[model samples]
Target: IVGGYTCGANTVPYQVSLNSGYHFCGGSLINSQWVVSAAHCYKSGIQVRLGEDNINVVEGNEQFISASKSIVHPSYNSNTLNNDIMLIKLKSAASLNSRVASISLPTSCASAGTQCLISGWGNTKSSGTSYPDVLKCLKAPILSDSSCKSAYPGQITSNMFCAGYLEGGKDSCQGDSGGPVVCSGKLQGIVSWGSGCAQKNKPGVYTKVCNYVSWIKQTIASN
Candidate 1:
């Protein structure tokens, strides 16, 4: 969360902290028993936390559960970050309450220039080693694919999109991977990769959720 503000307590019920032995990445609660995140975020021993505002301090409302199974997109590419999406099935269904709910998924492509939000528990500075104990967020503007390609020539693809600041001061940094990108009250993207954190003209690249809706639905249905 480079150049982000501390999010309000329990304001983001769908935001998920992907924790292993410690906090590493972020995700979103798509349903009571499922989490949607980046395929690159897939790691063993990771647990899911819902309704949690602070990562360091335990809260009565947090529904922490072990992942029963994790699935990554079979077509996911490591180098290019194509189809960088994944799913997590909770060992038990999360207890739904006011503080824990699912976010809506987008059914189509997100329009360019739309104001979106990306939240995570990543570092405030690119070189900083310290991580936040609470969630942080920043306003991100979705870039047109052409504008994004200029910033990342030969790197942009249909499966991926860009969002962030062109001036280089604000963007998702390391440790913010797999976080949700919400637009118009819908989950539109997943923090996938970037050239460097907050680099000039280098907006954060995200996995375009709309591109994989059919797969996401079929996978969940069959699983």
Candidate 2:
């Protein structure tokens, strides 16, 4: 499950620079000083770049924040990808700007049948290879908890949410994991899993951000 273009596709909003090259993904600005992303993304030698439209080209005047500390969830399981959340504390605060705006954490999540947006630079098609230089956005309706439970069976935990096209080809693909799922302008979910990119009947799974609200608040507040 952990493979190609992982860091840039569905991870954070900024591109991390490594000795190899740059990678792009979805990430959120929690405050003036921290960005929240997935623990898996930390493997590529993490660096957070905020307020940029073109990730492939570094020509724009984007605010680059260095991660002074990265703390992954204590219970995060490397094998199962459970408890996959993590925090990236920037060395300095980022100036609030429209393009570099932070998303508001949801006070409560929407019930089943609610529509939310998922954006990323991941592969557009299920069979397509390689990552897109430009970020793409798509919509998926939230699935009922019962439906998700049946769909994913033992993997459908309370900590997770489900969304995607019932008909297929309209869901988040590889590189979309750890990205933001926004509903009603609030951050609701974090991209996690799916059978494959845009596959029918296998809707994309996500970490229910609301379930970890207390942890997030504490992590951000203390750091």
Candidate 3:
């Protein structure tokens, strides 16, 4: 999503789309059976899609659902990514409206300059291939924590935070790791890692989500 701007139909109704046969990562939804994402974008069968914007056609206000359970985040640390978060769950139950719904999570904690927004289909080109069948946004802000730990000094972590333009363009890349960084509308952050795609001082590192709002409301209330 670097230097973004392509979202429209249903602007972002909790933007999801973490398929398995294709669309790598990006998720959010949060209710109608969980969804949050990142923990390295889990894997296993995955397939969630919800009202996607263009994800390669057939958009009848999507809603493909499938992931039965993916949990992750038990202190996930795929080599220093820290608790990168993840949830999944849905196997049915998403029938919201106006293009799907659910997205309020961050109880509080989006300070450092706020702004936010990020959405995605990932890569608008950070190096090679492009991957944007529509959906794409940007905005970016939130970067303190000692200027994101002096731009990844030992790799920032309070779970992680850092948004965009340290001197670069916009950010969020690689199929938008786990999408959504929202703000005021809630769902604080998620995208996860970064160091390329819109470089400069290196921004785009998310996953804070208000420090895991009670571990995502007790892991969706005891799963």
TM-score of 3: 0.36
Candidate 3 deviant stretches above 4 angstroms: 5-25, 28-36, 39-47, 54-58, 76-81, 87-134, 137-150, 156-166, 173-177, 180-190, 193-202, 206-223
Top candidate, metric TM-score:
1
For model 1, how does the per-residue alpha-carbon lDDT over 68-178 read when each residue is reduced to its tens digit? 899999998888888899999999999888789999888778988999999998878866566788889899899998989999999888988999988988998788899
Candidate lDDT values, in order: 0.89, 0.68, 0.85
Model 3 residue 208 CA deviation in Å: 16
Candidate RMSDs in order: 1.0, 4.6, 13.7
Task: lDDT winner between 1 and 3, please give it.
Answer: 1
lDDT string for model 2 (96-203, tens) is 755566777889867888888777666766775866665567767899988788777888777788887666767776666667788888888877777886666787
Candidate 2, residue 24: Cα displacement in angstroms equals: 5.3
Provide the clashing-pair count of each candidate structure: 0, 9, 0
Please identify model 2 stretches exceeding 4 Å from their true place. 1-20
Per-residue lDDT value at 94 in model 2: 78
| Full ranking by TM-score | 1, 2, 3
Structure candidate 2, residue pairs in collision: 8-24, 9-175, 10-175, 10-176, 12-25, 12-26, 12-27, 13-26, 13-27
